[PDB]
Symmetry: C2
C-alpha cells in the first residue's frame, strides 16, 4: 500500500435487447435478480453463468476494495465477452462498446478503478486501431486471450500486434482462455486447474522458442496471468530440451530462461513454496500482485500470500505496489 | 552407494514383416543400420522416429550404464508400442509379444536390467490377465499410458485396473502419451514441454478429485513420470479451488494435497529449485531417480541433479536407490 491488484474482471450492465443488436444468441448479456446481490450471465435466452454482484456494480466493489487492503484495482473483460470468433467488424463494433462500458464502470471512481481494453484480435488493423483509441480514451492497456484459436502467439500476425502495442507503450495482460483439452476435463473445473496453466505456459514458450523476443522491442510491457501458469516450474525442462535438440534451439539464440527479463507475471500461485520459486525465476522486479477477483478460484484474502511470505520487505513492496505502478504507469 | 534408474525405455528387435502380421499401417517396428549403431522406429513403410543403439542393444546399454555409474536400470516400452487404439485381441497378442521381448532384453543381464510390462489397457479383462501373467514371468510391474482417448484415470475401467494391480501387489508407472493439444504444438517439441507435464498432472488430479484414492487399496504402489509433470507446482491452485468451489470438492473428501501419501513421482525435473519444491511436496520417501534414458531430452548425466543438490545424504540415498528398492523389490 499503495496496494495494486492488477488482475480482476468486470461484466457490463447490458440488456438482452442491446446484445441481440450485435448477435441474438452469441453475444453475452447480464441478468439481474430482484434483490440486486445476485444475477447471471446469459447467452441466448438461456442461462450461461451465475454471477456475483461484485462483477458489475463499481460501488459494491469499492466497499470490498476497502474491506480488502486494496487501494487501486485494475480490471478488464471476462474472456466470455472477447468474441474472437465473430465477424471482424461486428467484433470491433462490439469491442468499442465494452471498452466504453468499462469506462462508464471506471467513471464511478477513476482513481481506484483502472481498466484494460479488449481488441478484435482476429483482425490485425482493427485490433491495433481499437487499442490506441482505447488507451487514449483512458484504458491503461489491453487484455488479450492467449491464442486464437489454433496457431498460438508466435504467429507473425500476433507478433505484429505485440510490436504495435510495444511501439506505442501499450501494456498487455495475456489471459489463458478457450482451452484446450477437448472433450476431456469435464468435472471438478479441471480446465481451470490443468488447461489454464498449460495455455499460459504455451503462450510464453511460443514467444521464447519462436525467437519473437529477438524481433520485439524491449519497450514491450507484457504480463501473463496466474504466475505464468506452470512456466516457472517447468523452465528447467525447457532449457534441457534447448541444450539437446537443434530443433528447440533453431529459432532461439539464447537459453529460454534468459528471456524472463522481457515479460511479467502476476503472483496468483496460491502457495508460499511456489511463490518463492516464481520470484527466484522471475525476479522480485517482474512479479505483480493479481487476485483474479471476484472469481471463487481467485485469492479471497487479497495480498495474503505475499504479505505472509518469507520474502524480503523490499520484495513485498515491489510485488504489492512498485511493479504495477511502473508497468501500468499509475502513481 | 548403489544407483537405480527407474525410468528408461527400450524398443525390441521387431522386423517389418512380423509387425505386418499385426498391422501393416500402425504396428511399430525397428529398422537398424548395417553397422548396427543408428536405427529408426518405423510405422508401416514410413519413418517414425530416429533412435540409437542403447534403445535395442543391452550390451551397448550396459557399457553406457557403466560410464554413467548406474548399477540397476528399470526399463519399459516406448509408448508408441502401446496400441491402445487397436482391436483388443490383437493388442493383447502384441502386449504379450512385446513383454516377451522385454524378458529377452533383460536376459542379457537380469540383475542390472529390470523390466515393466505393457497391457492391452483398452480391455479390462485382458489387461488384468496380462499384468498378472507378465509379473509371474519376471516383470517388476506395469507401465501404462496416462489416458485412453477421452478416458482419464478416474474412468471406472482404469480405476478397476489399478485396483487389480493393488490387490495383486503389482506396481505401476504411469506415463504421459497421446498428448492433448491437437494441431497447436507442432514446433520446438512443445508437446513434450507443455502437453506432457499437463497430461501427467491431469492423471494425478483425476485420481485425487474423483475420490478414486478412497476406493483404491492403500497398498497400491503407483508412480508418475517426469516428477508428476506440473502437479507439485500447481497443487496450491488445486487446494484453493477445492476450498471455495463445491463442484471441485463434491467427490473428494480431503484437501487434494493430503493425497501425496498415496503415490510417487520420478525426479526428472531438471532444476534444483524445482527438485526442492517437489521433495517438499512429496517427501524424500516418494521421489525416485529416473532419467528417461535414452531419449535426447532425458537426463544426459544420470543422477546429476539429485547429487548436486542441497538435500541431505539421507534423502539422496533414498531417491538414488532406497525408494526404488522397496517400490520395485530389487536386491
Ligand atoms: Zn482471470
Ligand atoms: Zn519416458
Amino acid at each position: 500500500k499503495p496496494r495494486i491488484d492488477m488482475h480482476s474482471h468486470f461484466f457490463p450492465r447490458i440488456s438482452e435487447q442491446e446484445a441481440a443488436k450485435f448477435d441474438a444468441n452469441h453475444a453475452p448479456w447480464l441478468q439481474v435478480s430482484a434483490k440486486g446481490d445476485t444475477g447471471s450471465i446469459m447467452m441466448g435466452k438461456n442461462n450461461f453463468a451465475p454471477v456475483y454482484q461484485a462483477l458489475w456494480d463499481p460501488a459494491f466493489r469499492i466497499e470490498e476494495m476497502d474491506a480488502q487492503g486494496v487501494d487501486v484495482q485494475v480490471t478488464c473483460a471476462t474472456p466470455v465477452m472477447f468474441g474472437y470468433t465473430w465477424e471482424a467488424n461486428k467484433a470491433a463494433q462490439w469491442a468499442e462498446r465494452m471498452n466504453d462500458f468499462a469506462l462508464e464502470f471506471a467513471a464511478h471512481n477513476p482513481q481506484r478503478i483502472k481498466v484494460l481494453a479488449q481488441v478484435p484480435l482476429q483482425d490485425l488493423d482493427l485490433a491495433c486501431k481499437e487499442a490506441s483509441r482505447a488507451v487514449a480514451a483512458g484504458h491503461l492497456g489491453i487484455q488479450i486471450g492467449n491464442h486464437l484459436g489454433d496457431k498460438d502467439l508466435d504467429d507473425a500476425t500476433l507478433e505484429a500486434f505485440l510490436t504495435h502495442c510495444a511501439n506505442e507503450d501499450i501494456p498487455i495482460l495475456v489471459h489463458p482462455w478457450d482451452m484446450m483439452g477437448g472433450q476431456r476435463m469435464k468435472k471438478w473445473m479441471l480446465p481451470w486447474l490443468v488447461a489454464m496453466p498449460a495455455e499460459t505456459q504455451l503462450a510464453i514458450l511460443s514467444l521464447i522458442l519462436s525467437g519473437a523476443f529477438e524481433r520485439i522491442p524491449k519497450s514491450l510491457k507484457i504480463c501473463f496471468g496466474h504466475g505464468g501458469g506452470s512456466f516457472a516450474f517447468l523452465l528447467g525442462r525447457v532449457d534441457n530440451a534447448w541444450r539437446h535438440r537443434d530443433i528447440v534451439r533453431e529459432d532461439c539464440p539464447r537459453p529460454p530462461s534468459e528471456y524472463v527479463d522481457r515479460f511479467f507475471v502476476d503472483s496468483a500461485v496460491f502457495n508460499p513454496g511456489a511463490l518463492e520459486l516464481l520470484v527466484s525465476v522471475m525476479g522480485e522486479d517482474r512479479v505483480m500482485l493479481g487476485s483474479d477477483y471476484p472469481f471463487p478460484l481467485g485469492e479471497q484474502k487479497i495480498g495474503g500470500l505475499v504479505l505472509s511470505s518469507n520474502l524480503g520487505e523490499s520484495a513485498k513492496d515491489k510485488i504489492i505496489s512498485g511493479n504495477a505502478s511502473k508497468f501500468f504507469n499509475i502513481n
